[PDB]
Design a binder for these strands. Structure first.
Lengths: 65, 87, 87, 65
DNA sequence: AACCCTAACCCTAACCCTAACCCTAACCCTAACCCTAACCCTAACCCTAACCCTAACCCTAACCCTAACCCTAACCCTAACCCTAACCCTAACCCTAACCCTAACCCTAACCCTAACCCTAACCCTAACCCTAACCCTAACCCTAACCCTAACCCTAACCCTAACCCTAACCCTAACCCTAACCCTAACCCTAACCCTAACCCTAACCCTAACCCTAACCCTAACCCTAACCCTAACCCTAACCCTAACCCTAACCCTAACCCTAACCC
DNA sequence: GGGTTAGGGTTAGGGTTAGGGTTAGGGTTAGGGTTAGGGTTAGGGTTAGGGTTAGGGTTAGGGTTAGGGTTAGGGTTAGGGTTAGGGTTAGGGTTAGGGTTAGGGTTAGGGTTAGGGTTAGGGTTAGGGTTAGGGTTAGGGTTAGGGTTAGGGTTAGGGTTAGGGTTAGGGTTAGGGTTAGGGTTAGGGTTAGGGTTAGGGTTAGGGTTAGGGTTAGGGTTAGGGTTAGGGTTAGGGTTAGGGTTAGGGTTAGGGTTAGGGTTAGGGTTA
């Protein structure tokens, strides 16, 4: 799984960022290591669909129409 | 008396030699290991769909017995016209 | 010989007033109608997760009876230690 | 579903492209209208993971060690 | 490849007689077709601008070897799962019967809704700007990838404390034995809540001038870290003689179900 | 406001039920000597400590001014007061009986490492990739307004269809045959279930030369108005020839029933 995440991120070695990518990608690994925090790594862009530019319509009208 | 019912011992009902004989009758010489589980799953899904269609037809016909005519009608509605059994 | 109702309580017993009485224990005044099904679902999955561990614990000593000790052990392993009934 | 796909693509009116987006996004709609082709619309970028640019220095050439 | 018995379900009459195909009589509205000219169905020409059509240059792959290494391929002894009668039963199907609930056909007579028809808005396009991937010229720093060298875990000759099977009493969890009121369902019912239309307006939202602030280059120097011996303080494992701590069984005390009676809220003038 | 109907504190009467001894006993708590493991100090080499010197590099602070999403004052609309039988529905016993669960024993089943000699484990090394800076350009997202224009409101005249009376089969509900799916048992043998193993069968690097892939130039040929004239589409009276329906007769058609022509195995030489 770490090699999978590594080729997904493309680097010469396995890094804790790739390890966190693989852990969050694998549902079984995420269920097993739930309370495990990997140092020297970021999170995954798993976001909802509300806080988006436009979408919610910042204008909605042109003052009159 | 009969104090038992049916269990998990149904997906394994389609024995491995039976699936192998089916693959040989089709045109397969060597069958892999995980082929049997996938074949059993596909057969179970198909049987579930056909049995659901037959149950819907029987409930619409105000009956409690699945007939070969209803099975043939469901198979024709799915897209598999079967001859012989029925008419 | 066998019961004609093979439903075996398909997530039953958790009726509308029953949920309209457990939600009141916490302090819910207005209970929506779309909460009974979610409550039944979460209760079913919690009972399944507990019974899996209970069966895994009872199958270790080659025993075919589930006692309260294994139940409270599986509950303490999950993170909810109960006092009184176990001991 | 068409409004969902429209706000996903952001346009002033519902277009056949948004309709095809919604049909392919909804699994039930895709299972129902399987043999239905929406004119004046494109497909969805639902692709595998093999045909990707990924030479990884290609190798095979001269010894770059 | 024919036999060769072996022999069972297909095998030529044949025979009612049930019931649908039919052989004495009648009405009915709907296949062509002739006037009609409408508008979609008969071809003719211009143009010009996105558009195809046609060479040069180049770089990753399609495919054919190359070694190589791991998986479902066929007997073997089973022996467990599985055909083969042979009855033996107990529950939906299957026949109408007569009664109704449930359906036609018809005479209006008002319902109302898309052809037409204008009018208003809400976009198809331009025009500037503003973001926005993407691998080459450098070049360069530890953070990236390749070998030399050395020093305690990994380690197997006798041995020694408990899961391996096994009878065995007895006890506890379903069995289908058993009723019964106090909880599960149900239909009509109304009075708060849920959910949207407009309207301020105040919060907020994208800049532009400004006046410091905090890691680079490191700039010096100081407080206990741990690996050196070792050292007397400390803490179980064979003892033994008590000694502390549940078990079964009477025992008697306050929480337990029941009947009768007085404070205490919303009713709406 | 009203009198006001309503639950909510008292009061025996057993009925358990926690608990007050009572020896029983026996685990089980509770005591010496010892030695070899279990702690307890100080010093060296070295990771921290603070106090400035440049040396930039954003930057977040302050003003600001439209503007829109909220947050208010209503209008329709759903589920909680009720009540009530009645058909379930969920408690409680009685047996009972039978599988199970602890209770005791006996051989594999575990410690340990001498021990010395590896062999994997671990510092220390300089040489190729690195990994992302810059710098375009061409592709990809925002806004006014006008030229149609594709729709949003009118509207009035006919094709429905909702209003109402009257019959006829077509379904509705029992009431038994019955029969064809459920329910067992002997048994035996045949279909199913286990190892191997090695060798084909995949699977991954290493040339090269074909073969697609982009951009510059024309020279079209494919996108658009204007007619206009004939070749079909399309409703409307009117037959008469193609149909539909209520009645017999009746030839053809649908359940049983044998005995005879081939249809499957099994030892047959080839």
């Amino acid at each position: 799984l770490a090699g999978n995440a590594a080729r997904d991120n493309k680097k010469t070695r396995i890094i804790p960022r790739h390890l966190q990518l693989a852990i969050r990608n694998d549902e079984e690994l995420n269920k097993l290591l739930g309370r495990v925090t990997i140092a020297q790594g970021g999170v995954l862009p798993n976001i909802q669909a509300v806080l988006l530019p436009k979408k919610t319509e910042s204008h909605h009208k042109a003052k009159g129409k | 008396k009969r104090h038992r019912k049916v269990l998990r011992d149904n997906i394994q009902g389609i024995t491995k030699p039976a699936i192998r004989r089916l693959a040989r009758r089709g045109g397969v010489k060597r069958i892999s290991g995980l082929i049997y589980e996938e074949t059993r799953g596909v057969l179970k899904v198909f049987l579930e769909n056909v049995i659901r269609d037959a149950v819907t037809y029987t409930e619409h016909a105000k009956r409690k017995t699945v007939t070969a005519m209803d099975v043939v009608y469901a198979l024709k509605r799915q897209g598999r016209t079967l001859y012989g059994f029925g008419g």
